[PDB]
Amino acid sequence: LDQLRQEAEQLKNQIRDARKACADATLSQITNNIDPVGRIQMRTRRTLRGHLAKIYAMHWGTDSRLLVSASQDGKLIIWDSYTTNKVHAIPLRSSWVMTCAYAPSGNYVACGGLDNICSIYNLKTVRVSRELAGHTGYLSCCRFLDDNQIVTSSGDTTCALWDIETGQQTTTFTGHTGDVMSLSLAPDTRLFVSGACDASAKLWDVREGMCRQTFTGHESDINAICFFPNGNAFATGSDDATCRLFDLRADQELMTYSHDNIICGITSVSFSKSGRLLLAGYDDFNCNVWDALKADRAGVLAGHDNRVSCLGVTDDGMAVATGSWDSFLKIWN
Amino acid sequence: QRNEEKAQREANKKIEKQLQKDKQVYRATHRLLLLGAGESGKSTIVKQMRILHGIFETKFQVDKVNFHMFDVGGDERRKWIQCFNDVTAIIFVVASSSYNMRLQEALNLFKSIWNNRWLRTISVILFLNKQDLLAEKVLKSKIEDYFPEFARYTTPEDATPEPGEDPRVTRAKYFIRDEFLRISTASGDGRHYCYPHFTCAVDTENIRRVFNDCRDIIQRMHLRQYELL
């Protein structure tokens, strides 16, 4: 119907006008008087070996002790960072995997792959506790809400929430135009956001199940997302070299991190414990660290040959780990 | 303390021994990706394959050489291509008889797939099914009626025809291959090659053909590695 599409445009124009009216001053101008962090130099403290093929993603443990890594060969290996010694090596039925997560209590580990099934493993007993099925597209990310509920994202536009015992979709979130390839959880369990193949990245409410906001700053595919430690802002890294920091209380974006030299995409984004430093990977053989307050570069992390596809920061914030398409890991401090 | 350290050391040791042991098993096998357009006829081709021994995986071994396939079930931009940059070869199936009903669509995928930044060093083993049906349509829907570049491609200069019911069908056979090979030659520095084959609905030496193609690909890769080509 002709009228329906227009009604839609008028609403978009009103939203844009409201966002423009809410704008008062540039975010960069506010933090002009902040003293710069300066040069930050960190070196590799440990090197982890034992993987055969390219790795995809990893997740630090709730304690700063352990971490879990997954690779395309089809094995989950739980390292011990302090003594660089393996603990478990769980084979998988399907070789291709694209995500992993580590339970808050430390009693469960989950891994989802290109096969349309999310499976959970029990550490203390290993065997497959339950198999979660129902999606129509390949999985992209998954996180543990608690010991009982897990929220996942799929290649189809749907994002769902499961229950381990029942094994059924308690709630389904729909509205995305294309494929979803990112997800993160707030410090509390109330809210979570996602970034899809379309430039739009929205915010979802777990209990309500209704979308609350929509951000469309970027102009290409979105490949990473994370929350500010406060919980009132989130930063995004897209296929274009630009990295942008959105806001929740005010819909419009605040600052953009980009440079002329960089022409490669971003595959992972994470924040420091204090939130001052924004650490982002790159398609090139490098990992760059920025300053969140004034968009000034700090340092360069090098020592990877193939790519950088995973990144995470420990809860206490003492160490940062990076992954690669090479078989090797790396721990920085 | 020391006993705890001892225990961790012993576990690392068992895990490492088993991981080294499977390293040889992992390195021995060869991986193939199978991709094709709709209604091409890949299910029939997999039949002789299962005879040798969301994602369907096939394991078959010939002459003490292990092969393992990956059929992915699907007009969508694909972000799972990056995950398939380590396969030895890609099997591509195109229905030659399906011109009146889509061929332009298949070629459209081939350039798309031929120019990815992640599949630069991967060669393609190309099959052409529905051979029998092609002869019947040419011998009323003609290529000239549907395609405007049909002129002048009827005869192959190096044509080595099998005894043929139709000199004319031999004209339709080599027009499609020339269109497919026109894209393969244009991009890449010789790191990747195309292997065209002609196969009817009933065929038996498919395993032999794929074995020979894989051997040729590996020999070419090793020759280029040591700077002899």
Binding site: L1, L4, R5, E7, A8, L11, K12, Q14, I15, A18, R19, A21, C22, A23, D24, A25, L27, I30, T31, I34, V37, I40, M42, R45, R46, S81, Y82, G175, M210, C211, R212, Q213, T214, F228, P229, N230, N232, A233, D247, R249, A250, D251, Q252, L254, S272, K273, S274, G275, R276, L277, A292, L293, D316, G317, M318, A319, V320, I331, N333 | -
Partner: protein, 55 residues
């Protein structure tokens, strides 16, 4: 689907009614948090080797 167009029509209306706060408050909150939690961050300042467990 005509409905997907219909579904979008009420959805945009729902998301446009939220109150918008000026950027000054959000920027001030971010700056205040970053400045207050600077000491607790072990990556911003080089931790002593003795306190470092990795080294």
């Amino acid at each position: 689907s005509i409905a997907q167009a219909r579904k979008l029509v009420e959805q945009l209306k729902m998301e446009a009614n939220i109150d918008r706060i000026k950027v000054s408050k959000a920027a001030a909150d971010l700056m205040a948090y970053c400045e207050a939690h600077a000491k607790e961050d072990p990556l911003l300042t080089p931790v002593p080797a003795s306190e470092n467990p990795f080294r």
